[PDB]
Amino acid sequence: MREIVHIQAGQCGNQIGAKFWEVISDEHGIDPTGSYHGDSDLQLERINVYYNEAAGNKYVPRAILVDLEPGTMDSVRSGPFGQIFRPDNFVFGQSGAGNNWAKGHYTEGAELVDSVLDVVRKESESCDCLQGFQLTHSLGGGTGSGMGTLLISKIREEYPDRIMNTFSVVPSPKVSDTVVEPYNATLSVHQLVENTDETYCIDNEALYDICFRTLKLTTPTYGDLNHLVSATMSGVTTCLRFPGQLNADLRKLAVNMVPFPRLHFFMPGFAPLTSRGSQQYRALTVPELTQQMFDAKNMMAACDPRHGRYLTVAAVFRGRMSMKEVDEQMLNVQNKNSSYFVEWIPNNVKTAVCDIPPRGLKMSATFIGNSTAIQELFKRISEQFTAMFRRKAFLHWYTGEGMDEMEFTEAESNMNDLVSEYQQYQ
């Protein structure tokens, strides 16, 4: 039935999507050669959702890879599962972005987005029922931010009735990875708030904190954080591929999770998370998953949700469970902590149950929360952006390409209006 076109831009996006496709190929029993060698019919029942069948018992992941520098794509091709992608969809330039959003959005993106869109159209014409587009990208990377904004605008113009989902890496509250992160983040949000349907805000800081405190990892890598992000990504769309007692596709998620069209940024979560030694000491139950999900320390977004209220909560469970068990847990959660949900939305939690657990687990659950506390993140970004813009810090790099002061001013105004809207609804 429904299908998904996975778009993968930037260095961050390329790495996250490589790990994501490794996980997806593992879930469907597909070896690095593309030949299916699984053990269950459900692996092939909805294999078309992400894979095109190239005759010869081989399947090609319906993925599109975008970058302005060929090094990351070289690493992807040479690494494991590098041959799993049909080499037709490696669309890359030569200049690179240099973390300049203006560059990647007006010059290098303007040069490469035509080939990117041609590949997108070719992949979409092969679809029986296109459901939504997925974009994996960071907000700080010039390639990620610029290519994402430009390509999202173009695709929204071409397909106005399709779902535009993005998984964005947001700036950290303590340590910056790029000096000009604020300009890129502000100019990216200034378009994401207009063209996207929903955006999942994942911060690397929260990932480090979770993998250190919970998983007890001492040497975490980008691979481990990408593994967590990929587990979340797979839990998001597990209902589009496997049967269950209560299924919910992308359209129901977008409807239930976005009360007003502009308040569409969410904080994802995941459960269960345990260290290796502690696995033998804690029973895996639905109450345990519910307790782990609704906890501030397990939020992958660097924002304490106890500082605001929730507009809505999505909780997709995986594995065999009792419906009454999940319902009772959700009722207890809403009743004991009613002070953290807005008074103008009753029945704040929408749930779904998939009958296929992640490999190695008896059951799991994916958390998706629309909390008004993300105004903290947006206000921090706005304040830092204002502090930099008041002194024309690094402004000439953006102005030389074609941007003017009016664009930065309008972006700041839009950001502050979004913050004011979140404050209004809290």
Binding site: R390, R391, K392
Partner: peptide, 25 residues
């Protein structure tokens, strides 16, 4: 019958060039 070639040298009034205060308002 000579005198040393001493000149009165001064960078009198030099203003900055980077408009670091142009958006201070």
């Amino acid at each position: 019958k000579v005198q040393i070639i001493n000149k009165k040298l001064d960078l009198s009034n030099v203003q900055s060039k980077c408009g670091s205060k142009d958006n201070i308002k």
